[PDB]
Amino acid sequence: ILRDNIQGITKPAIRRLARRGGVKRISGLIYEEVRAVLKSFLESVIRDSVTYTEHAKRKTVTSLDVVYALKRQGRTLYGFG
């Protein structure tokens, strides 16, 4: 099945995910702009993800190719495959 639903309503995970670094008391309204910044970052990594896949000419995705893309956007999340 393939139907569009809204996973932009991700989860309120940032009230533990901003609990990864030294976020003090939070005071909110960050949910929509943390939503905006992570949607920008995921769309940035996913369009060159699928770009190598059409240069891969097979309709899966993979990890060595995702780290190829991930360093070519500069934000090289190093070390997984």
């Binding site: 393939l2 569009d4 639903n5 809204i6 996973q7 991700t10 989860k11 995970a13 533990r16 995910l17 901003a18 609990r19 990864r20 670094g21 030294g22 976020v23 003090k24 008391r25 939070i26 005071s27 309204l29 960050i30 702009e33 943390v34 910044v37 992570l38 949607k39 920008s40 970052f41 995921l42 769309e43 990594v45 996913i46 369009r47 993800s49 699928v50 896949t53 059409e54 309709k59 899966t60 995705v61 993979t62 990890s63 190719d65 995702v66 780290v67 991930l70 934000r75 999340l77 997984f80 495959g81």
Partner: protein, 97 residues
């Protein structure tokens, strides 16, 4: 039922998570997230588990970087909450796009 002052309990939960290194966002939530952002601009394609795991690894690392230096920008203004103008000043100092 005795529970004393809030706020330094924020500090022990601070040290509680950053001792640990568990992958902090939830799995099938990012699964449906990355499918339903990928399927639209380019058509129906398939994923692999290690690749998607690594790409939310990228998502975590990038956004934890941006909120820690957002915290530094917030405490510039002598203030302890987190508010939006800190966030967009952080995004702008970080090289707008």
């Amino acid at each position: 039922p005795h529970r004393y002052k809030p706020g330094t309990v924020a500090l022990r939960e601070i040290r509680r998570f950053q001792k640990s290194t568990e992958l902090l966002i939830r799995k099938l939530p990012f699964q449906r997230l990355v499918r339903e952002i990928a399927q639209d601009f380019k058509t129906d394609l398939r994923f692999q588990s290690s690749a998607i795991g690594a790409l939310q690894e990228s998502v975590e690392a990038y956004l934890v970087s941006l909120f820690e230096d957002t915290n530094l920008a917030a405490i510039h203004a002598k203030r302890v909450t987190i508010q939006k103008k800190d966030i967009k000043l952080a995004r702008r100092l970080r090289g707008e796009r």
